[PDB]
Design a protein around this ligand. Structure first.
Ligand SMILES: O=[P-]([O-])[O-]
Lengths: 103, 103, 103, 103
């Protein structure tokens, strides 16, 4: 089971996206664990993720998070997919980042 | 909701950035850099002011969904904004004390 | 609800204990006991960290009762936790000042 | 609601006045007026105590509208009261520091 960790300031507004992603992962039997955390834990929690996703509001922090976790694929969630709360779409992008990372 | 929810995320992030700047301002004071501290507080204040202004609108037109009831998120923004504003004010006082400490 | 409600009580108590320890830490500083103050601060931080971690889970899975709506108590725990964490951080700064005051 | 709503307004105003007095108390300290500062803090505390007492009643009998659910405004008063009380306590510490600073 791969760990997909999302970051935002407190971990709420993204919490709704996480619940929809979990529903989708169950529907299609994707072996993943999805958790939302505030951006303050990106360095502490990110070390255990298989893929690190940043909320659209914290995109400006991408370079810093990449330097903090040089051994993890880190990327920003598409703002439209995020605004629309597209659990399936974001789940797809996360699995993709993992595949493109393992090869 | 769509905007209100995305707006709250922005407010939470803004409030978080405000605090971050405030703590950074304090750090400058510890380094004996009163000039940089002062500049950082000013920007932090401006950030909050803009955030507070947005919240003001969010409280004036909090109606729509129901009569007595209001948007629940109003609190996620108020809580973060109130905490950040208070923190900054106290931090400002703390910085002034550093100045009095001579250092 | 059952757990969520009992959990909030625990969080409120934990947050309260955290503040209590923080104030106690400050009191130690006033007595000129930097060692005890430092130790008390560390424990307070750890208590908050555990409390924050529990809240994080409570925000990631805040869904269930309804789509847009979330557990009401989430705020109660957030309010107490946010206040306690902020107070503790400021108290830490205050303690550092006591150290600079020489005493 | 009628009273609860009007009561919250009173609490918010009271909390605001409390903070106002607290900051004013601090200002007195900056002027080197420990006597006036002390008097102002005492009054601020009494104002908060009365406000807290009213809130206590508002939390003990928060039932009526529904089983699990409680008055929404309870938070509004709690948020303001918690922030004001915390601020005042920290301000008290800050004032004590001014006294230690000799000035
Ligand atoms: O918890 P969040 O949506 O900043």
């Amino acid at each position: 089971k791969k760990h997909i960790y999302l970051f935002c300031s407190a971990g709420m507004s993204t919490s709704l996206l996480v619940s929809k992603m979990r529903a989708q992962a169950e529907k299609y039997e994707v072996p993943v664990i999805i958790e939302a955390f505030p951006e303050t834990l990106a360095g502490e929690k990110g070390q255990n993720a298989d893929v690190v996703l940043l909320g659209p509001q914290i995109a400006y922090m991408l370079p810093e998070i990449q330097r903090l976790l040089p051994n993890k694929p880190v990327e920003v969630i598409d703002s439209l997919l995020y605004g629309k709360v597209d659990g399936l779409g974001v789940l797809k992008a996360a699995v993709a980042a993992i595949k493109k990372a393992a090869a | 909701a769509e905007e209100l929810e995305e707006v709250v995320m922005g407010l939470i992030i803004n409030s978080g950035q405000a605090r971050s700047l405030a703590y950074a301002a304090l750090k400058q004071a510890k380094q004996g850099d009163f000039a940089a501290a002062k500049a950082m507080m000013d920007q932090s204040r401006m950030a909050l002011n803009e955030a507070h202004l947005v919240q003001t609108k969010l409280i004036e037109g909090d109606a729509g969904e129901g009569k007595m009831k209001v948007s629940l998120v109003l609190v996620h923004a108020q809580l973060h904004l109130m905490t950040s504003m208070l923190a900054r004010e106290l931090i400002t006082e703390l910085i002034e004390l550093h100045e009095k400490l001579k250092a």
